[PDB]
Fold RCaMP, Green fluorescent protein.
Amino acid sequence: SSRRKWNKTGHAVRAIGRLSSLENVYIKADKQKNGIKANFKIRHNIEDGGVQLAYHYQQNTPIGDGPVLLPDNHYLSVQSKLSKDPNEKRDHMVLLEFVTAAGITLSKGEELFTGVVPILVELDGDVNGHKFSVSGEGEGDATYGKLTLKFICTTGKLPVPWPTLVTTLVQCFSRYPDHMKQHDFFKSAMPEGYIQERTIFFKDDGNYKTRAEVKFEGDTLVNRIELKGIDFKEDGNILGHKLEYNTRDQLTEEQIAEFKEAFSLFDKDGDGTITTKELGTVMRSLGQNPTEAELQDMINEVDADGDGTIDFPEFLTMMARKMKDTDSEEEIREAFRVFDKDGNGYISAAELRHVMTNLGEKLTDEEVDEMIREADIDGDGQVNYEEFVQMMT
Amino acid sequence: SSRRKWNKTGHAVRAIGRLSSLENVYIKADKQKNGIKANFKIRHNIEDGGVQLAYHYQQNTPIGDGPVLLPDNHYLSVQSKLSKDPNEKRDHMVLLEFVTAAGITLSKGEELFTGVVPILVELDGDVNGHKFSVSGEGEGDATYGKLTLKFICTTGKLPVPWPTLVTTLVQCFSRYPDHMKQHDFFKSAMPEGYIQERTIFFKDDGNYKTRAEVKFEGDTLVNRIELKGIDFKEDGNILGHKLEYNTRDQLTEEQIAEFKEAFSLFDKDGDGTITTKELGTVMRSLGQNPTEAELQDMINEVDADGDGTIDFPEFLTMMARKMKDTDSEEEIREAFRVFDKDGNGYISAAELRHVMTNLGEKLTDEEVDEMIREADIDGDGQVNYEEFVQMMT
Ligand SMILES: [Ca+2]
Ligand SMILES: [Ca+2]
Ligand SMILES: [Ca+2]
Ligand SMILES: [Ca+2]
Ligand SMILES: [Ca+2]
Ligand SMILES: [Ca+2]
Ligand SMILES: [Ca+2]
Ligand SMILES: [Ca+2]
């Protein structure tokens, strides 16, 4: 039938789009410049529909003369979230970002990034003759590939949309997994730093050319940029400000922080990933004793890059999974039974603290009492299943 | 805060459940019996909530004396869909199943399964003294790991729920990828066949013990089973028929068949998986010429078992992906532009046939006309964007 022919041809053509839709940042060595090159495309959603493509071409070279690491081909996977500060009057962007290297299967610089690192960003721009500046500050935690920053336009109104400046405004904060440590050029160039140059082509519109110096100044990682844009159309998507600010929707900063706290309970050594030993330790603490092979099978069923561990973005994907309403409810039932160790249908204060302390939290009885009090609708001093449901909902 | 503590502890406990939730069928060699062993658990949804667990223990041994293949540890991934025949008065089950081997990273028997194979299934059962029989027939297409069968209770009312009999009622039809051909015990035992024995333990209830002979009789693959159940509770979930029949919901047989037809357009050699060469061929046919490395990157971003190809269940996952309403609409825009080769905003009959013939279909002009006619709301002889949207929606 014609409708069947349409449907199947449609699927095929849509499949081409999904199969060919490279969203990752692809990195290759540039041995002749003792550095790297990258290319990728950014899809900027246009207000009221459509996308504005931005083709990125990138090259990086060391500032110092110390030896650096030149990588085999690989990529970075980026999850970004843009938001606003309700208390901020200046034109601004709040940014949360997780970035993880992958694509390859199973020293001084690395040490600089094991903890939380303060970040300063400064950009002076010229787009079609319009002069502007941006300042940003925040922190980087390369262990989880995490960035949190706030940027301000210090010259008033930004003459271009914030999302077009995201890639320009610190890939040294990417998480490189253990088996890819020898492929992290960005950290290897530290503390002296690297130069990062891009041309960014906005299709049917102008282009940005950027040059940046990324280096430590004392204990702060600093990104200092010059940007120049040319050939932009007065009422194009850029100068005409026709791009969406943030994506609809997104699991929000607060929820992510909750999942991260949960993640830390498993990631006992704080190295940014969960191993079989760590999952085993957690399960053993709650009374379950699966074998090493079983733990490996368990991790495999939710391991996306086959590295044998669950990193934070993998943890997030597992927990953000859709779930049928029936599965969701049964999962909550199973969770209740975990808390309710004696199976009497009520979570006591003693059972709550046993669970949390075993997971690796350090609560006083008074803190446990307050959690109980929060959920204890009928005031009997315990949390029944119905009360537990509300609390988890 | 207490709510934050609850939320994060909740996530952690729920994460344990999702991390530990082995759903795959785990296969290991049983060299002493010249065969294999397996174990897995099935979660049967209980009507009005809850799950009935069924712990499976399995062993298989060859019927013949010819040499067989003993595998390294691996697993089978199963997607099953139960349905009913509205025209069927007998107690019955309609079943569609895709089964794919994995878990291992990068002869006479195999040949028997390269095409569609007819299947007959017969089971004589005794559960708590209740005698019953089931007959089934259908086809297997191991190339896609696909089974399609219909089963009838030939003794009247089935004294147990259909879903509890699914695993008992032909793993020779699993798709084993090229790099795992030496690990396919099931096909290696053919045509002479194998004995398959299980004990299935239903938690807080009775157990099934099964013995089956799976072998070719002429050109038909036959599964002949004896089942005995003991210790079942009169008003347990089994004898009391308290289990859900099918899962809510599921992309339906008709949609899957459309996606399979779409898949075949890429899978030009019909070997059940899409390579970089095949995606390249398809894209080249529509005017796109990505490099081999680009095609490999493209496939990687949607490759789940890292084997470097996209099999049918991987294709389905890619196409069943959630998609934000805005992404969905832009994807349809991009698809339109593919059909509308001259960019005039209208898909002509000439443009439609060019697209379909290049994808690898063989339509007459009259068939193309009918597709146009189906979508051509305003009768101008072409398909505009609004008309295209309706057709894809
Ligand atoms: Ca760890
Ligand atoms: Ca992983
Ligand atoms: Ca209790
Ligand atoms: Ca209570
Ligand atoms: Ca193929
Ligand atoms: Ca694959
Ligand atoms: Ca046209
Ligand atoms: Ca028309």
User: Anything to note?
Assistant: Chain B touches chain A through 85 residues (CB under 8 Å). Residues 2-19 of chain B form the longest helix (18 residues).
